[PDB]
Design an enzyme around this catalytic site. Structure first.
Site, PDB file in Angstrom:
ATOM      1  N   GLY A 182       0.695  -1.329   0.041  1.00 45.26           N
ATOM      2  CA  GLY A 182       0.046  -0.012  -0.049  1.00 45.26           C
ATOM      3  C   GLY A 182       0.742   1.252   0.197  1.00 45.26           C
ATOM      4  O   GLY A 182       2.106   1.181   0.187  1.00 45.26           O
ATOM      5  N   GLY A 225       0.719   6.043   0.609  1.00 46.26           N
ATOM      6  CA  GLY A 225       0.006   7.044   1.000  1.00 46.26           C
ATOM      7  C   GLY A 225       0.542   8.323   0.814  1.00 46.26           C
ATOM      8  O   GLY A 225       1.786   8.238   0.087  1.00 46.26           O
ATOM      9  N   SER A 226       0.188   9.477   1.392  1.00 42.43           N
ATOM     10  CA  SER A 226       0.919  10.873   1.111  1.00 42.43           C
ATOM     11  C   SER A 226       2.400  10.978   1.281  1.00 42.43           C
ATOM     12  O   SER A 226       3.069  11.401   0.177  1.00 42.43           O
ATOM     13  CB  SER A 226       0.404  11.978   1.923  1.00 42.43           C
ATOM     14  OG  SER A 226      -1.207  12.047   1.695  1.00 42.43           O
ATOM     15  N   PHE A 227       2.884  10.229   2.042  1.00 47.18           N
ATOM     16  CA  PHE A 227       4.503  10.515   2.337  1.00 47.18           C
ATOM     17  C   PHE A 227       5.449   9.373   2.358  1.00 47.18           C
ATOM     18  O   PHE A 227       6.463   9.241   2.654  1.00 47.18           O
ATOM     19  CB  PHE A 227       4.448  10.981   3.772  1.00 47.18           C
ATOM     20  CG  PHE A 227       3.646  12.052   4.312  1.00 47.18           C
ATOM     21  CD1 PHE A 227       3.445  13.060   3.413  1.00 47.18           C
ATOM     22  CD2 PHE A 227       2.906  11.811   5.307  1.00 47.18           C
ATOM     23  CE1 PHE A 227       2.509  13.965   3.799  1.00 47.18           C
ATOM     24  CE2 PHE A 227       2.035  12.866   5.816  1.00 47.18           C
ATOM     25  CZ  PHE A 227       1.880  13.974   5.021  1.00 47.18           C
ATOM     26  N   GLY A 228       4.690   8.150   1.736  1.00 48.88           N
ATOM     27  CA  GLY A 228       5.608   7.061   1.346  1.00 48.88           C
ATOM     28  C   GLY A 228       4.710   5.709   1.408  1.00 48.88           C
ATOM     29  O   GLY A 228       3.693   5.911   0.657  1.00 48.88           O
ATOM     30  N   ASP A 268     -11.147   8.010  10.544  1.00 49.74           N
ATOM     31  CA  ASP A 268     -10.925   7.433   9.047  1.00 49.74           C
ATOM     32  C   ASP A 268     -11.214   6.035   8.938  1.00 49.74           C
ATOM     33  O   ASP A 268     -10.698   5.090   8.336  1.00 49.74           O
ATOM     34  CB  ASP A 268      -9.196   7.538   8.685  1.00 49.74           C
ATOM     35  CG  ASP A 268      -8.965   7.863   7.270  1.00 49.74           C
ATOM     36  OD1 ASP A 268     -10.080   7.980   6.644  1.00 49.74           O
ATOM     37  OD2 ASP A 268      -8.047   7.460   6.693  1.00 49.74           O
ATOM     38  N   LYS A 292     -13.261   3.393   7.427  1.00 52.75           N
ATOM     39  CA  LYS A 292     -13.599   2.921   5.849  1.00 52.75           C
ATOM     40  C   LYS A 292     -12.762   1.471   5.617  1.00 52.75           C
ATOM     41  O   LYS A 292     -11.822   1.189   6.248  1.00 52.75           O
ATOM     42  CB  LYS A 292     -12.949   4.060   4.958  1.00 52.75           C
ATOM     43  CG  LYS A 292     -11.463   3.975   4.906  1.00 52.75           C
ATOM     44  CD  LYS A 292     -10.834   5.213   4.053  1.00 52.75           C
ATOM     45  CE  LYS A 292      -9.571   5.468   3.987  1.00 52.75           C
ATOM     46  NZ  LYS A 292      -9.264   6.807   3.072  1.00 52.75           N
ATOM     47  N   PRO A 293     -13.477   0.630   4.907  1.00 54.36           N
ATOM     48  CA  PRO A 293     -12.866  -0.560   4.454  1.00 54.36           C
ATOM     49  C   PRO A 293     -11.510  -0.500   3.976  1.00 54.36           C
ATOM     50  O   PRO A 293     -10.581  -1.655   4.258  1.00 54.36           O
ATOM     51  CB  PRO A 293     -13.802  -1.094   3.330  1.00 54.36           C
ATOM     52  CG  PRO A 293     -15.085  -0.504   3.671  1.00 54.36           C
ATOM     53  CD  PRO A 293     -14.503   0.943   3.908  1.00 54.36           C
ATOM     54  N   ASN A 299      -9.162   0.806   5.823  1.00 54.26           N
ATOM     55  CA  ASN A 299      -8.314   1.047   6.647  1.00 54.26           C
ATOM     56  C   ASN A 299      -8.783  -0.503   7.679  1.00 54.26           C
ATOM     57  O   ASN A 299      -8.207  -0.315   8.900  1.00 54.26           O
ATOM     58  CB  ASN A 299      -8.505   2.169   7.534  1.00 54.26           C
ATOM     59  CG  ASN A 299      -7.778   3.470   6.491  1.00 54.26           C
ATOM     60  OD1 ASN A 299      -6.994   3.226   5.998  1.00 54.26           O
ATOM     61  ND2 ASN A 299      -8.252   4.643   7.106  1.00 54.26           N
ATOM     62  N   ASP A 337      -3.790   2.647  10.036  1.00 52.90           N
ATOM     63  CA  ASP A 337      -3.624   3.965   9.506  1.00 52.90           C
ATOM     64  C   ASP A 337      -4.407   5.004  10.688  1.00 52.90           C
ATOM     65  O   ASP A 337      -5.366   5.397  10.093  1.00 52.90           O
ATOM     66  CB  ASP A 337      -4.358   4.060   8.033  1.00 52.90           C
ATOM     67  CG  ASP A 337      -3.272   3.508   7.031  1.00 52.90           C
ATOM     68  OD1 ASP A 337      -2.231   3.240   7.338  1.00 52.90           O
ATOM     69  OD2 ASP A 337      -3.744   3.224   5.743  1.00 52.90           O
ATOM     70  N   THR A 352     -12.280  10.880   4.949  1.00 50.40           N
ATOM     71  CA  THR A 352     -12.605  10.410   3.754  1.00 50.40           C
ATOM     72  C   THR A 352     -13.973  11.111   3.430  1.00 50.40           C
ATOM     73  O   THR A 352     -15.000  11.123   4.142  1.00 50.40           O
ATOM     74  CB  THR A 352     -12.847   8.883   3.557  1.00 50.40           C
ATOM     75  OG1 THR A 352     -11.212   8.359   3.766  1.00 50.40           O
ATOM     76  CG2 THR A 352     -13.035   8.176   2.036  1.00 50.40           C
TER      77      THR A 352
END
Ligand SMILES: CC1(C)CCCN[C@@H]1c1ccc(O)c(C(=O)c2ccc(C(=O)N[C@@H]3CCCNC[C@H]3NC(=O)c3ccncc3)cc2)c1F
Lengths: 350, 20
Positions: free
Chosen positions: A50, A52-55, A166, A168-169, A171, A184, A201
């Protein structure tokens, strides 16, 4: 009747005492976080699970044990640039202090000149997201197995004054036993009273977040409702191609249910997805218990879910350690560590 | 149907959070 009143009126005393002892354990590690418990070169890096924004999160192997983990690698510099120091710091500080059967366990964390690292238990089942979309939707008993884990998880986090923000499926990882491990914690925050940041989200945002109202715990209970609707329907209650159309659907006060939803589901959902904060389940005088005692949860042995004694209605293909069939494929990037320490002061407490 | 509207939308993929 009367045996369930001794059982119910005793389960609650066990829960009051579990939570008190959990607040002590949490507060200990919260006021004194573990730092620098490993190093990069102790793990072989195999594959990205997976991003995300920073890595990214990577499947990795710890060479001394041969145990597989999921390592989150964040680039300190992009974090500073996006003004998210605080959110990245909350994430690690909270993961390292929390402890519950449906929360991803943090094993080690460390930093080097370039990056932050969090090494967590590997959940080879992949994300709920992935099986939800493949299959279309889950049956209500299947959705309810998952929901009950979320209900107790929030009961835990909210007792610690934490807010998750946060749900949501994407996470919600599925472990080898078919139970949930929430990840997360990027948006999580320890807070008494009100907070204001507009984050989350779009689909899962509570109305009081969209409206800049200043909000609390209760936005998580709104989100639980969105989750149960998405699980049961195969789509969320509010969607549209542009976020601004989602937001107006969310604040309109209005929701439509599939003809296949049971009346109990529809009624649980009408009380979670409630714009009026004085009326929303999770947020009334009785708190979480209004949700636990709701008719849709009549078949739920809350204690047996905590103890993981209930059969997961879906145990994923487990082709042995270090296998990633239940995960998507991502572009790989080489990990580059600098000879110059970046952002040392900003990240001292990590 | 509502499920076809969803499948034909651009929100069926992995979803990102925002930070306003
Ligand atoms: C809250 C947002 C997302 C708002 C937008 C700006 N960045 C924020 C933000 C805040 C904190 C953060 O740490 C980050 C990140 O940089 C970041 C970096 C990587 C990932 C990431 O790869 N997580 C994966 C994939 C995304 C969906 N959740 C599942 C997660 N995978 C796992 O956690 C996992 C655990 C165990 N076994 C296998 C996998 C998620 C977030 C981050 F991007």
């Amino acid at each position: 009747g009367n045996a369930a009143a001794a059982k119910k009126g005793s389960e609650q005393e066990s829960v009051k005492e579990f939570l008190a002892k959990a607040k002590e354990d949490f507060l200990k590690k919260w006021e004194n976080p573990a730092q620098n418990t490993a190093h990069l070169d102790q793990f072989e890096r195999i594959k990205t699970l997976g991003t995300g924004s920073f890595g990214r999160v990577m499947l990795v192997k710890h060479m001394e044990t041969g145990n597989h983990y999921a390592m989150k690698i964040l680039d300190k510099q992009k974090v500073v640039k996006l003004k998210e120091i605080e959110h990245t710091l909350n994430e690690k500080r909270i993961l390292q202090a929390v402890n519950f059967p449906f929360l991803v366990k943090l094993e080690f964390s460390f930093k080097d000149n370039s990056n932050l690292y969090m090494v967590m238990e590997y959940a080879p089942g992949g994300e709920m997201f992935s099986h939800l979309r493949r299959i279309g939707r889950f049956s209500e008993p299947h959705a309810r197995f998952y929901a009950a884990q979320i209900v107790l998880t929030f009961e835990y986090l909210h007792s610690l004054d934490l807010i998750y923000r946060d749900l949501k499926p994407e996470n919600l990882m599925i472990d080898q036993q078919g139970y949930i491990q929430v990840t997360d914690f990027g948006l999580a925050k320890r807070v008494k009273g009100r907070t204001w940041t507009l984050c989350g989200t779009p689909e899962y945002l509570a109305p009081e977040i969209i409206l800049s109202k200043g909000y609390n715990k209760a936005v998580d209970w709104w989100a639980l409702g969105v989750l149960i609707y998405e699980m049961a329907a195969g789509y969320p209650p509010f969607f549209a191609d542009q976020p601004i159309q989602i937001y107006e659907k969310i604040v309109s006060g209005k929701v439509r249910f599939p003809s296949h939803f049971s009346s109990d589901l529809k009624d649980l959902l009408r009380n979670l997805l409630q714009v009026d904060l004085t009326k929303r389940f999770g947020n009334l005088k009785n708190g979480v218990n209004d949700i636990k005692n709701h008719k849709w949860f009549a078949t739920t042995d809350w204690i047996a879910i905590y103890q993981r004694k209930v059969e997961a209605p879906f145990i994923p293909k487990f082709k042995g350690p270090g296998d990633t069939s239940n995960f998507d494929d991502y572009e790989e990037e080489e990990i580059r560590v600098s000879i110059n320490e970046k952002c040392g002061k900003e990240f001292s407490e990590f | 149907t509502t499920y076809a509207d969803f499948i034909a939308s651009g929100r069926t993929g992995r979803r990102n959070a925002i930070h306003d």
